[PDB]
Design a protein around this nucleic acid. Sequence first.
RNA 1: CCUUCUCAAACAUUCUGUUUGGUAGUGAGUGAUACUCUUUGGAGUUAACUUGAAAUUGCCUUAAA
Lengths: 65, 133, 257, 244, 159, 194, 53
Amino acid sequence: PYEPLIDWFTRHEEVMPLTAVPEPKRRFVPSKNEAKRVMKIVRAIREGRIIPPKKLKEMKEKEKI
Amino acid sequence: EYSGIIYVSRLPHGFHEKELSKYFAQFGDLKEVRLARNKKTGNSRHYGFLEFVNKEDAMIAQESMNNYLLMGHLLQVRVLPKGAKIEKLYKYKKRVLVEKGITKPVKQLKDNMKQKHEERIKKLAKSGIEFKW
Amino acid sequence: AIPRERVIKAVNELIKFTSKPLLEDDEEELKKDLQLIVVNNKSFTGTSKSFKLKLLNVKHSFYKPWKEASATAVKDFKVLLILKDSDIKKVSEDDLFDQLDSEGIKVDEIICGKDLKTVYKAYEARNAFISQFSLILADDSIVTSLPKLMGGKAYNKVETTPISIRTHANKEFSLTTLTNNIKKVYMNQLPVKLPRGTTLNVHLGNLEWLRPEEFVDNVELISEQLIKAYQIRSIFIKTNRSPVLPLYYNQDVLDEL
Amino acid sequence: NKFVRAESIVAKTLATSREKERIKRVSILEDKKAKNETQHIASGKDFILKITEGLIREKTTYDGKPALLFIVRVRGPLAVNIPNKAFKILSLLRLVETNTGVFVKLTKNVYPLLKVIAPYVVIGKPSLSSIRSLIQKRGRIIYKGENEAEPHEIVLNDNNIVEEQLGDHGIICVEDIIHEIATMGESFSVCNFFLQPFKLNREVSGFGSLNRLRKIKQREAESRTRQFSNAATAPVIEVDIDSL
Amino acid sequence: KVPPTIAQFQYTLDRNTAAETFKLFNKYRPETAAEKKERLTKEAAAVAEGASPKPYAVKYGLNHVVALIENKKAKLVLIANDVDPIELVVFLPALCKKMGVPYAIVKGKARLGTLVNQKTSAVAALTEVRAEDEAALAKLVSTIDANFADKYDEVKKHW
Amino acid sequence: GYVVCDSDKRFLLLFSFLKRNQKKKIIVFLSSCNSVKYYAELLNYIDLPVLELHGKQKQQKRTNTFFEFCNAERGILICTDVAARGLDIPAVDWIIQFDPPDDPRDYIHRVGRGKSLMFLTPNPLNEYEFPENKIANVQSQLEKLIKSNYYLHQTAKDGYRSYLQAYASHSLKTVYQIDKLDLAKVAKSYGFPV
Amino acid sequence: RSQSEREEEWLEKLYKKHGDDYKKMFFDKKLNIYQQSEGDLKRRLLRWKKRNG
RNA sequence: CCUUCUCAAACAUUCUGUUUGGUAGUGAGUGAUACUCUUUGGAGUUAACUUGAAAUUGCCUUAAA
């Protein structure tokens, strides 16, 4: 009832990867999703709805004293 | 079968007889511990031998330290059969230079230098080279 | 002053010894190329095995043609600069190219003290990093720390052991102090070690560089600086395992023994 | 009684290798500095680094003037066991215990010994309030108990205890002890071994929620406000003791 | 009674090796959602006023991983034994054996989650690595192949 | 005659030659015209200014570059077997075919018109004893260089593939898909056989 | 339809470095990060030249 | 499972110049004639090359629980 699992297929290691899928440009190039987020926060700073990290220190250096 | 004498290789940079005796003491009473070193300078060859008073203790240490990743290189431990004892491994310190120099007079070594220098000019002529003075 | 005639005669005998009757150049080319000028003394630095490279002043650069046609050789000549932890934060490679392409020398890679103890701390990674480079330069401060960070195999050669370069104008770092001292070490100085024993060879390098009349000027000034600073015994010009060429021979230094 | 791991037992030796070689190195250069055989060493003089508070590193040479220091025990570095040359100096200064202070005068004999213990101690010139508040807040006196017991160390509660133990040297009260400690006088060697060491409380002082994070914040602040030079020409790091 | 490809688990990596795995792995933490956000606000502050290299962090989705094994991107793979459906991973140690990719069953599914900012993970793998730790990885691998792959050659057999 | 080298030390040995033989005029022959689109990108990138010839480029370029090689003094080109047929230059000292040839019989006619040698571990004039130590240490430099450009990842992809496709469309008993891909990939610098 | 405030400023950086040498521009790393091909790059340039010079 | 001796003077200011001193290294092996000393023992030097840090025995305690 309890035979050892005779690995009839994993005995021989594979040389090549399974699929020949061409690697995309985005795997080598700096990410465009990151660029999208950055250029969204940029707008938010021009509009003034996100206060920059440099001024956030100055908002607490003057307050909570 | 197997014997109480053990072989350890792939030792860490600075894992000596002090720490081989101290760490493997926790496995039990060890008889006699050594570590092979260079004679030109006193430092480890990264392999040593130690013996237990108990044969069973030797196989338990081997079971627990055969592949032990220890600061950049994994400890390799092997049991020994009947015989093949721990023989000739000496504690070699850093060997210092000894100043044996002058003894012979200056006029002896001067004409010795003259002999070697004139023969030196008479040496190039033996194999296709001609050089003045 | 040494006789220049015997230097001309020596190098001519070296030309004759190199003109004698495989697809790679494993040993044949090195034994052809490598000149070494031997300097003998009664116990150089007799008790202290310091790794200071004596920068012997020479009129003409041998590093320059060593660059120009190491470009043709399989082993390339690349200039390394070990700096301190504030320098790379201050100074890029582009400024070095800006001020050193003017004469025509190229800084290959700039290296921090951090990099030799983290990324190039693996032994094969360390050995394969340094052995690629021939000119090793190190800012004065880091030089004393370098026997540990780059190991002993880096010190067994004369190429791979670093040269102490000053980059500090009154302890403050300046680019200019680097810019002119890199020039002086490169074109006007030949480094050589000092062993605790008696024998010392000076790695002049390839015989093919600087037409033999220039080689006389090299050897002349080397003797002009090694006999003045230290009392010495004997000098020999030698290509790898030749019958030696006795050049200078002194009989007044041995009288003190 | 616990088991000792292999990694720790090699780490201790690997760190004491650096400490034995470091202490011998400083020992050689300081021995060669005193004998006036300054022929071929790194530097034949003494610098002191004064780090204050945005962290300015000063570089000033040590004068021949006798100064007043308050040495504070640290616990550092990590895997190190103290060698013989450390056991000796820290026994003489009676600083075997962690988080423990003592007063000493700094001269041309005191300063070479200071370079040896510099990875174990944090030094600095205190102010009048640092001294005066320290003595009126902490203070031990080893003397006889009721009738039989000797090793009682109690507290600087009284001034009549000060009379009985010192008295004839000119010292009558605790404030007079503060006088001979702040100003270098005759009775300083008398009262310095009278307040043997101080018992400073440790920083943060807990293992838990807030205390682990506060220890993390301070532990990274350590390596910024203190460096281990390890060289034979180690500049002695002086810090603010008024802040500490 | 257990069929051999199940409880090819439970024969996990040992104590000393395990910690050393995390010694490596905790070096390759993915940025936290807080951290990622502040990084970008740091960018926005900067790039609104006036270069970077690709960042190594471990890889953590079961998908992403099963992609990565079989594509050779993977170097080391960590596989937690206790998983809600065991079947969700049972193939995985064999797949790796077949693509020759070094793998170790780690103990504690939550313990993987630690190294990856998540609650659990089932599987995490270190694909690419920093220059200094390159050697550290390849040695760990060997350590794993000794104490896990070679020690348990009979893990494919015995019920 | 020939040099015996493994698929790892194949392009390693070639690169070792081209730097030292910069002064001379030598010829490298490949099977594919998609293999030379890789080599004539690497060597121009690592500053050994070689010339490029293949079927996939235009005729006026194929003419005006090959003409320049004839009128040169120091030059070096990379061209295929089929493209270099009938236009051979006497200004030569090393005819070194890198890949296995199209016809094992017609290559004899290609030589006697220069010194000929082949490269064969899986598969008259004299053989050449080869030093193992003095190969150029530009492999990990190329391994970093491949995975950081994309264009050279694609040209290496269709370098490795086209070479191996031409290797399988051979006729000899020697050249019949024996070479393992764990060695052939490192010639084009890979961690996995594409 | 126009081009972006950064894109334009990034294009200025290319033209003032290479001019009309698209090959060198395509193999650059310091200015051409997202490894855009010649055709993509020159298209942007022809456009940028139309709003400027 | 800690991480490594990260700069000083004497003179000179050409916007930094000269001179002086500062470093004891993983192990194991391959290696083609020369250097001085010693008196037979190698003592100490002198190119270069191999290698996943490889290997079979040269006569203080709040850095805890």
